[PDB]
Amino acid sequence: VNSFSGYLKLTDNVYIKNADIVEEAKKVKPTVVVNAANVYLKHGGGVAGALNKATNNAMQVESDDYIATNGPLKVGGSCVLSGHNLAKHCLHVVGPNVNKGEDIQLLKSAYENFNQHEVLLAPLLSAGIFGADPIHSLRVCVDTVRTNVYLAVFDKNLYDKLVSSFLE
Ligand SMILES: Cc1ccnc(N)c1
């Protein structure tokens, strides 16, 4: 139903909210929820771990089956799997892990995947354990994505930094 509420306009197609993406997915019933995945689709922490836990491991079992056919995703790549109880679809996107020296230029590639979907509930890509500056990631999102993005940021302090950087 894509019943988004309380999202702040950043650009005509990028909105942001201080919220837990799992709780958003349950309220919003989005067509697409984006996971911040790794190449092995192993949902062991951060957004991925949260989304998987909210599916009671339905997402991890489906992810294992895909990886059985595909082998690992490429950095900057994506796949579309079931959203289970969270969404119609989950778009698993692999941003670069800058801690492992993966090129930050692949962040644009990662966000380009969003352009295959009209409306998405998403996190910022390559933030947290992937080591990219989250405000940088928001700039790449805004520059790259032309479809409608509703970004969920869990931490209030980071949310206020992002909004201050973007609008002040
Ligand atoms: C634990 C956790 C980390 C990041 N985003 C969330 N929604 C939840």
Domain residue spans of the chain: 1-168
Q: SS3 breakdown of the chain: % helix, strand, coil, rounded to 5? A: 40, 20, 40
Residue ranges lining ligand 1, Cβ < 6 Å? 20-22, 46-47, 50, 154
* E strands, 39-142, in order: 78-82, 89-94, 119-122
* Structural tokens at position 96: 């670069």
Radius of gyration in angstroms for the set of CA atoms belonging to the chain, rounded to a whole number: 15
Q: How far apart are CA 67 and CA 72, in angstroms?
A: 6
| Residue whose entry in the numeric block shows the structure tokens 């352009």 | 115
Round to whole Å and give the CA distance between 45 and 43: 6
Q: Take atom 6 of ligand 1 and give the residue whose Cα is closest.
A: 47
Experimental method, per PDB record = X-ray
Which among 31, 34, 37, 28 is positioned nearest to 60, based on CA atoms?
A: 37
CA of 50 relative to ligand 1 center, distance in Å: 6
Q: Resolution in Å, one decimal, please.
A: 1.4
Q: Which residues neighbour 130 within 8 Å (Cβ) at sequence distance 6 or greater?
A: 36, 95, 96, 97, 98, 99
- C-alpha 53/C-alpha 60 separation (Å) is 9
